[PDB]
Design a protein around this motif. Structure first.
Motif, PDB file in Angstrom:
ATOM      1  N   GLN A 129      16.779  -8.310  -1.717  1.00 19.18           N
ATOM      2  CA  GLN A 129      17.311  -8.470  -0.369  1.00 19.18           C
ATOM      3  C   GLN A 129      17.230  -7.160   0.408  1.00 19.18           C
ATOM      4  N   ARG A 130      16.689  -6.128  -0.234  1.00 22.44           N
ATOM      5  CA  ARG A 130      16.533  -4.813   0.371  1.00 22.44           C
ATOM      6  C   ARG A 130      15.063  -4.574   0.685  1.00 22.44           C
ATOM      7  NH1 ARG A 130      21.062  -0.374  -1.295  1.00 22.44           N
ATOM      8  NH2 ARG A 130      22.735  -1.855  -1.799  1.00 22.44           N
ATOM      9  N   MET A 131      14.788  -4.131   1.910  1.00 20.41           N
ATOM     10  CA  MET A 131      13.429  -3.976   2.408  1.00 20.41           C
ATOM     11  C   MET A 131      12.949  -2.530   2.388  1.00 20.41           C
ATOM     12  SD  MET A 131      12.052  -6.968   2.923  1.00 20.41           S
ATOM     13  CE  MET A 131      10.593  -5.927   3.002  1.00 20.41           C
ATOM     14  N   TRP A 132      13.674  -1.634   1.708  1.00 19.22           N
ATOM     15  CA  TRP A 132      13.332  -0.213   1.716  1.00 19.22           C
ATOM     16  C   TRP A 132      11.945   0.052   1.144  1.00 19.22           C
ATOM     17  CZ3 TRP A 132      12.229   2.334  -2.830  1.00 19.22           C
ATOM     18  CH2 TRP A 132      12.557   1.654  -4.007  1.00 19.22           C
ATOM     19  N   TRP A 133      11.498  -0.783   0.201  1.00 21.57           N
ATOM     20  CA  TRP A 133      10.199  -0.563  -0.425  1.00 21.57           C
ATOM     21  C   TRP A 133       9.072  -0.676   0.590  1.00 21.57           C
ATOM     22  CZ3 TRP A 133       7.427  -5.279  -0.453  1.00 21.57           C
ATOM     23  CH2 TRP A 133       8.205  -6.424  -0.239  1.00 21.57           C
ATOM     24  N   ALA A 134       9.189  -1.606   1.541  1.00 21.05           N
ATOM     25  CA  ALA A 134       8.167  -1.737   2.576  1.00 21.05           C
ATOM     26  C   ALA A 134       8.094  -0.484   3.441  1.00 21.05           C
ATOM     27  CB  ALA A 134       8.446  -2.969   3.435  1.00 21.05           C
ATOM     28  N   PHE A 135       9.252   0.027   3.871  1.00 15.26           N
ATOM     29  CA  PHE A 135       9.274   1.225   4.706  1.00 15.26           C
ATOM     30  C   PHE A 135       8.700   2.429   3.971  1.00 15.26           C
ATOM     31  CE2 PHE A 135      11.879  -0.189   8.319  1.00 15.26           C
ATOM     32  CZ  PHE A 135      12.376  -1.376   7.824  1.00 15.26           C
ATOM     33  N   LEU A 136       9.054   2.597   2.695  1.00 13.58           N
ATOM     34  CA  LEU A 136       8.512   3.718   1.933  1.00 13.58           C
ATOM     35  C   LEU A 136       7.011   3.557   1.715  1.00 13.58           C
ATOM     36  CD1 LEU A 136       8.751   6.291   0.319  1.00 13.58           C
ATOM     37  CD2 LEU A 136       9.571   4.951  -1.632  1.00 13.58           C
ATOM     38  N   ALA A 137       6.586   2.369   1.273  1.00 10.56           N
ATOM     39  CA  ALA A 137       5.187   2.136   0.947  1.00 10.56           C
ATOM     40  C   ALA A 137       4.296   2.228   2.173  1.00 10.56           C
ATOM     41  CB  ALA A 137       5.026   0.770   0.279  1.00 10.56           C
ATOM     42  N   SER A 138       4.830   1.953   3.365  1.00 11.82           N
ATOM     43  CA  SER A 138       4.030   2.098   4.576  1.00 11.82           C
ATOM     44  C   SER A 138       3.562   3.537   4.753  1.00 11.82           C
ATOM     45  CB  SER A 138       4.834   1.634   5.790  1.00 11.82           C
ATOM     46  OG  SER A 138       5.161   0.261   5.675  1.00 11.82           O
ATOM     47  N   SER A 139       4.495   4.490   4.695  1.00 11.10           N
ATOM     48  CA  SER A 139       4.124   5.899   4.782  1.00 11.10           C
ATOM     49  C   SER A 139       3.278   6.324   3.588  1.00 11.10           C
ATOM     50  CB  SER A 139       5.377   6.764   4.886  1.00 11.10           C
ATOM     51  OG  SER A 139       6.090   6.487   6.077  1.00 11.10           O
ATOM     52  N   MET A 140       3.607   5.819   2.393  1.00 11.43           N
ATOM     53  CA  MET A 140       2.861   6.204   1.198  1.00 11.43           C
ATOM     54  C   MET A 140       1.392   5.808   1.310  1.00 11.43           C
ATOM     55  SD  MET A 140       4.946   7.872  -0.695  1.00 11.43           S
ATOM     56  CE  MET A 140       4.135   7.943  -2.288  1.00 11.43           C
ATOM     57  N   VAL A 141       1.118   4.572   1.739  1.00 12.24           N
ATOM     58  CA  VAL A 141      -0.271   4.148   1.891  1.00 12.24           C
ATOM     59  C   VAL A 141      -0.915   4.845   3.083  1.00 12.24           C
ATOM     60  CG1 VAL A 141       0.218   1.960   0.738  1.00 12.24           C
ATOM     61  CG2 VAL A 141       0.231   2.048   3.250  1.00 12.24           C
ATOM     62  N   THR A 142      -0.165   5.042   4.178  1.00 13.81           N
ATOM     63  CA  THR A 142      -0.713   5.718   5.349  1.00 13.81           C
ATOM     64  C   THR A 142      -1.198   7.121   5.004  1.00 13.81           C
ATOM     65  OG1 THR A 142       0.670   4.428   6.860  1.00 13.81           O
ATOM     66  CG2 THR A 142      -0.156   6.532   7.674  1.00 13.81           C
ATOM     67  N   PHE A 143      -0.541   7.783   4.056  1.00 14.93           N
ATOM     68  CA  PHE A 143      -1.015   9.095   3.626  1.00 14.93           C
ATOM     69  C   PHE A 143      -2.126   8.969   2.580  1.00 14.93           C
ATOM     70  CE2 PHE A 143      -0.539  12.948   0.942  1.00 14.93           C
ATOM     71  CZ  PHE A 143      -0.863  13.894   1.890  1.00 14.93           C
ATOM     72  N   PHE A 144      -1.843   8.276   1.469  1.00 15.37           N
ATOM     73  CA  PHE A 144      -2.758   8.257   0.329  1.00 15.37           C
ATOM     74  C   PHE A 144      -4.077   7.565   0.658  1.00 15.37           C
ATOM     75  CE2 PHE A 144       0.751   8.642  -3.118  1.00 15.37           C
ATOM     76  CZ  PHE A 144       0.806  10.000  -2.878  1.00 15.37           C
TER      77      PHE A 144
END
Length: 59
Positions: free
Chosen positions: A1-16
């Motif tokens: 029920q927590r969406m924090w993974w999407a917010f983190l992974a967005s920046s992670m993929v945007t960099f990597f």
């Protein structure tokens, strides 16, 4: 029920992924008015240009 993974992974993929595709483009190049706008964008931002000074102060 927590969406924090999407917010983190967005920046992670945007960099990597972007770094990976830049490296891949360099590898493909090795295996194998843009200048005007580049110089214009480089001449707005400068330590001596007043526009660059007010831009960095504003940012």
């Amino acid at each position: 029920q927590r969406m924090w993974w999407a917010f983190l992974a967005s920046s992670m993929v945007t960099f990597f992924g972007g770094l990976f595709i830049i490296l891949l483009w360099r590898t493909l190049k090795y295996l194998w008015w843009m200048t005007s706008v580049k110089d214009w964008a480089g001449v707005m931002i400068s330590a001596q240009t007043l526009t660059g000074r007010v831009l960095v102060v504003l940012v």
